[PDB]
From Swiss-Prot:
Residues 337-420 form the KH-like domain. The keyword GTP-binding applies. Belongs to the TRAFAC class TrmE-Era-EngA-EngB-Septin-like GTPase superfamily. EngA (Der) GTPase family. It comes from Bacillus subtilis (strain 168). This is GTPase Der. One of its GO terms (biological process) is ribosome biogenesis. Estimated to be present at 7000 copies per cell. SUPFAM superfamilies: P-loop containing nucleoside triphosphate hydrolases. GTPase that plays an essential role in the late steps of ribosome biogenesis.
Amino acid sequence: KPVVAIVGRPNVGKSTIFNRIAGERISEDTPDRIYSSAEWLNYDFNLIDTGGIGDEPFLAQIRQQAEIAMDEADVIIFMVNGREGVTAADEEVAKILYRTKKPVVLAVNKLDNMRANIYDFYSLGFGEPYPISGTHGLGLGDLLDAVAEHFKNIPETKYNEEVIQFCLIGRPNVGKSSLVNAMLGEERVIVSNTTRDAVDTSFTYNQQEFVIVDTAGMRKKGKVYETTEKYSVLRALKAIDRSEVVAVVLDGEEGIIEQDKRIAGYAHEAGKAVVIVVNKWDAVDKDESTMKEFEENIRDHFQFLDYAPILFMSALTKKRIHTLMPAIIKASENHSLRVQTNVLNDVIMDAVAMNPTPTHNGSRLKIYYATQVSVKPPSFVVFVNDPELMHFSYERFLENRIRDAFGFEGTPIKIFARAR
Ligand SMILES: Nc1nc2c(ncn2[C@@H]2O[C@H](COP(=O)(O)OP(=O)(O)NP(=O)(O)O)[C@@H](O)[C@H]2O)c(=O)[nH]1
Ligand SMILES: [K+]
């Protein structure tokens, strides 16, 4: 079932790594020239081979084939040639593969792990570069480890790449069902159309394709009595895996409860963009200064969700319901957001300029370079002398500096340390 792609510029030796691992052609899949993976090789997957019968010239071939790969394949082996380092022609191929939520693994062809010394590869922004010998097959196993690892994260339910999926999560009786039907009744929304894909509500808002994942979970309770939360809770954690934005909805009336932290924590530690919703705010009786007293109340108990918005709204009175889709669309953008490597590093340079780096006992930390590695959430790698020397307090001081530069509200962000 999993389908691996093999993208790059022309003459990087795609076909030499393709014919190494591509087994036998299979002309009963959702089909192209499809090849089952090597029978000798112990992972099982499908090679996709690009052959789309627009414009013909130099630049407008990579457009065509990378697009096809981006659409059908589940993991994408972006492949470069190491015989002269990176090219601006490759940087352009990287720019085409930036427009995709699916994971992309860099392959540096014809080098050692040694000759893979150039920061230019990391700058492309698909994480660790993996060196290969297309002649000898060296370094191909560790590569396919990085490919196969992403098979346990491949969705069972898929949509068009332009579609954005999300979920509403919360305890028993907080208005998730009411909230959604208000958002459907909403002015700007249009709907769509048995069982297999009759579980998620597919609407459009501002001519943008949108999926609410597991409306079936809303619709279950209504035909079924409450045996336990433990089933709804885990059915929500299943939806978060499929989703990209988690709309973590509280009840304004009772306030925050132990169990709220459980379902939200998972979304943070899943890495998804979080947008908190305080429903039933009509039923909250207000004074001069209570709504901000409710926020500062939220930020103690949810101190792992700082980056998230907090809204207040109501499904009954229809107050601030219009705010919901806006906040989502924002979280999606920030969650998907990819940054430019020159700009990033200047922010990192600026970061040290203000606050001196950590001292240990003479040997001070130095930051050499910094690159974004993947999106959703946006993940960064700071290159230093000593990864152990960069402490978390400094590590997130860089987050806040990076958040200042490119916004980031809605998304969490990953910072890593590598060396050498
Ligand atoms: N006053 C007020 N009541 C609300 C609001 N939103 C929902 N409710 C009430 O909250 C009750 C329970 O929430 P419901 O709409 O079923 O959504 P739910 O939290 O998904 N139910 P479940 O937990 O079983 O999935 C409903 O009977 C509804 O009338 C609101 O904005 N204001
Ligand atoms: K270097």
